[PDB]
């Protein structure tokens, strides 16, 4: 009786939100950006090849200086690369080799990683002993760690396969805030540039916008038909793009609270692993299961170019803070650095 | 062309490369085994004989180092991390023979033995384990014999025309799992009957792994 009545009210509320979004859907982003000229053909060459991982690479993250990057592989090795020289700065042996994510702190003093061990491990890069040591092991998730991102040297946000995200106080080792509401495994998260909000994509084919300080879900974004594997904020923080197993990328708007554009092709039938934007946000770069990275026109939904330099899945990618280059990691155990030429 | 500090940084990178190569060679020699099986299937008892996320068991037997990975504690979506174990030497699957007449606790309407069949079929026919052999442990054989006298296989298998002898009942269950193998040429299934008092379970894994290693070398050379 009471349960049946309540679940009917949820359907009424869902229709109310859907009608509200349709009311403000006066135009389409495709119609708005029809007049602007296309980006043309985007040609990028492999400037660097980072060799040394002996297993599948699962994650990479640039440092804020746009020169150092950290990559994680399931050979149990965290490697920090000097991208200008291809020098290996550090090689961190992981206690658990089943790593799925890695993060570089914006200060450059810490890196984080974690996988099927349900732990986010923090590594100190600047010690008087000259070696990288574990500074914290963040326990509390009951599923695998899918993504982690530093807010500063003391705070980090993690998403897990137990359907929840958590905000951690690194010094105390406790999760100050728990973000619940996903009905599937949360696979990725992206921080807003001001680090006051973050979006997360789960296997319930939905993306939720969370307030870091308040600790509740502000908005929920649906439209995907399969699990979301990747998510990335637009450079101004007012939009984000997702990548799913349905071979599509979608651009959702925070203020319009709805999807704005879909990035899919008929030839593309494989899942998407990673998404990122160029510095101006005009380009959307996505890594795919078909061993390729497709560069999309964010405004016009046109495939601007292809990065074809890997013999297995493109598992991760990232664009430097200065926008100079893009790195692609792959299951073939190699990292490649790309940029164009005049 | 390089400065004094640049040359020293390159030398440090070379030392890191040397250490990465040594670790990879050591890892390649070890045998990786994925330990699978439903709950209350005797899988925990197997680990003790072999002596909150993933549990890794390390043991050595006849100069062979084994790394067994237990993933039963993980309750998340299997398809999001099952590809992480692509490349293991073999998969060890545990099935409790005494659970043929039992009913799944959560579902209350699904046979416990039939629950393992759909799990075995998914793993055996998984795209990530096309060329991976499977070691099948049929546990609780002593308890299975006791239940056979009271409860026949007709409850678990309505379309069973065999007798109720211990040997015939156990053999039929083994053939049921091996028939789920939709790729009988790329992979092989090794079936063993285990018990809590058995001490030859480690030897069977070693013999099965040795057979997998030999066939891997023959396939690599292109002979197969």
């Amino acid at each position: 009786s009471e349960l049946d009545q309540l679940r009917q009210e949820a359907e009424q509320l869902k229709n109310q939100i859907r009608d509200a979004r349709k009311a403000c859907a006066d135009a389409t982003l495709s119609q708005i950006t029809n007049n602007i000229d296309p980006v043309g053909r985007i040609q990028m060459r492999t400037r660097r090849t980072l060799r040394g991982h002996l297993a599948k690479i699962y994650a990479m993250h640039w440092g804020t200086d746009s020169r150092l990057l950290v990559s994680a592989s399931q050979d149990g090795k965290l490697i920090i690369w000097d991208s200008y020289t291809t020098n290996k700065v550090h090689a961190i042996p992981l206690r658990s080799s089943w790593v799925m994510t890695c993060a570089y702190a914006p200060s450059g003093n810490y890196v984080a990683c974690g996988g099927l061990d349900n732990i986010c491990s923090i590594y100190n890069l600047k010690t008087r002993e000259g070696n990288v040591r574990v500074s914290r092991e963040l326990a509390g998730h009951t599923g695998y760690l899918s993504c982690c991102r530093f807010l500063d040297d003391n705070q980090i946000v993690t998403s897990s396969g137990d359907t929840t995200c958590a905000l951690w106080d690194i010094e105390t080792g406790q999760q100050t805030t728990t973000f619940t509401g996903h009905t599937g495994d949360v696979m990725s998260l992206s921080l807003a540039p001001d680090t006051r909000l973050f979006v997360s994509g789960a296997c319930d084919a939905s993306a939720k916008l969370w307030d870091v300080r308040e600790g509740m879900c502000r908005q929920t974004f649906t439209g995907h038909e399969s699990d979301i594997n990747a998510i990335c904020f637009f450079p101004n923080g007012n939009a984000f793009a997702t990548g799913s197993d349905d071979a599509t990328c979608r651009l959702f708007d925070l203020r319009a609270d709805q999807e704005l554009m879909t990035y899919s092709h008929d030839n593309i039938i494989c899942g998407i692993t990673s998404v990122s934007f160029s510095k101006s946000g005009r380009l959307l770069l996505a890594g795919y299961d078909d061993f390729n990275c497709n560069v999309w026109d964010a405004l016009k939904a046109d495939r601007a170019g292809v990065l074809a330099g890997h013999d297995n899945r493109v598992s991760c990618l990232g664009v430097t803070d200065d926008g100079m280059a893009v790195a692609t990691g792959s299951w073939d155990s190699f990292l490649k650095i790309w940029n164009g030429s005049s | 062309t390089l400065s004094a500090e640049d040359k020293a940084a390159v030398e440090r990178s070379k030392m890191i490369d040397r250490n990465l190569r040594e670790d990879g060679e050591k890892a390649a020699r070890e045998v990786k085994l994925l330990l699978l099986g439903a709950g209350e299937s005797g899988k925990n008892t197997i680990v003790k004989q072999m002596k909150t996320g993933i549990v890794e068991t390390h043991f050595t037997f006849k100069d062979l180092h084994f790394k067994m990975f237990d993933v039963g504690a993980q309750r998340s979506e299997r398809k999001k991390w099952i590809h992480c174990f692509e490349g293991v030497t073999a998969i060890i699957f545990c099935v409790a023979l005494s659970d043929y007449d039992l009913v799944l606790a959560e579902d209350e309407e699904m046979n416990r033995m039939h629950a393992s069949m759909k799990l075995f079929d998914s793993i055996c026919n998984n795209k990530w384990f096309t060329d991976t052999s499977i070691i099948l442990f049929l546990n609780k054989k002593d308890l299975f014999e006791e239940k056979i006298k009271k409860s026949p296989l007709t409850i678990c298998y309505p379309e069973y025309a065999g007798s109720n002898t211990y040997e015939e009942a156990a053999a039929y269950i083994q053939c049921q799992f091996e028939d789920l193998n939709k790729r009988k040429d790329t992979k092989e299934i090794y079936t063993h009957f285990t018990c809590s008092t058995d001490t030859k379970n480690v030897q069977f894994v070693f013999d099965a792994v040795t057979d997998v290693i030999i066939k891997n070398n023959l396939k690599d050379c292109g002979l197969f």
Partner: single-chain antibody
């Protein structure tokens, strides 16, 4: 804590042999390259030798090449300096210096206490030998080099050290602008090409000492004469 203890120094006869040891504790010894730096009594610093991490690269100063042998024992965390045919020119305090090299590292960051031995090329110039100073006042120290220390990679391999009276040298500024760990922000290093300045805002009692500018562009590493601050 990070420690570097030297031993084996003492009075030796001319033409003799002596073995200096540097025991390291509290840090990953095998990860650091090691230098020997000596200082003649009432004189400036003089670089002696270098052995890299992993013992693959070894460099010597010309004045000691062929007579000195530098070696390390990574399992024992001990650095050695075998000296032969010792001359009166070798009478100095010999310092054990650790230095690690990767992008953004701070070489020459920690020095040992040193051991005293008594026996019976880019030019770095510090023309100002002494500078009278008062507490709370800003002081600038100048250094010059015969060659440009700015490399084509953008680094300017100039280092600043402070040797307080009775103490081992401490790193202040590495690569001409970066501030070493544990050094107050009042120290600032500024330079261009061949001319460099170390500015000390709001000088304090601890800052009193001799300041050395060292180049790390190429071997042999050379020190300036040193500028002394006195009250």
């Amino acid at each position: 804590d990070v420690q570097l203890v030297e031993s084996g120094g003492g009075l030796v006869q001319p033409g003799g042999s002596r073995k200096l040891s540097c025991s390291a504790s509290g840090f990953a010894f095998s990860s650091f390259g090691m230098h020997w730096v000596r200082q003649a009594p009432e004189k400036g610093l003089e670089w002696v030798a270098y052995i890299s991490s992993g013992s693959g690269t070894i460099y010597y100063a010309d004045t000691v090449k062929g007579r000195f042998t530098i070696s390390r024992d990574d399992p024992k965390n001990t650095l050695f300096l075998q000296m032969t045919s010792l001359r009166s020119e070798d009478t100095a305090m010999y310092y054990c210096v650790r230095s690690i090299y990767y992008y953004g590292s701070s070489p020459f960051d920690f020095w040992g206490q040193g051991t005293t031995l008594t026996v019976s090329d880019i030019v770095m110039t510090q023309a100002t030998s002494s500078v009278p100073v008062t507490p709370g006042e800003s002081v600038s120290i100048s250094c010059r080099s015969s060659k440009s220390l700015l490399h084509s990679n953008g680094n300017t391999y100039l280092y600043w050290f402070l040797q307080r009276p009775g103490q081992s040298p401490q790193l202040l500024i590495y690569r001409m602008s970066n501030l070493a760990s544990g050094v107050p922000d009042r120290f600032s290093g500024s330079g261009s090409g061949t001319a460099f300045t170390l500015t000390i805002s709001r000088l304090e009692a601890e800052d009193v000492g001799v300041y050395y500018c060292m180049q790390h562009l190429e071997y042999p590493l050379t020190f300036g004469a040193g500028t002394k601050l006195e009250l």
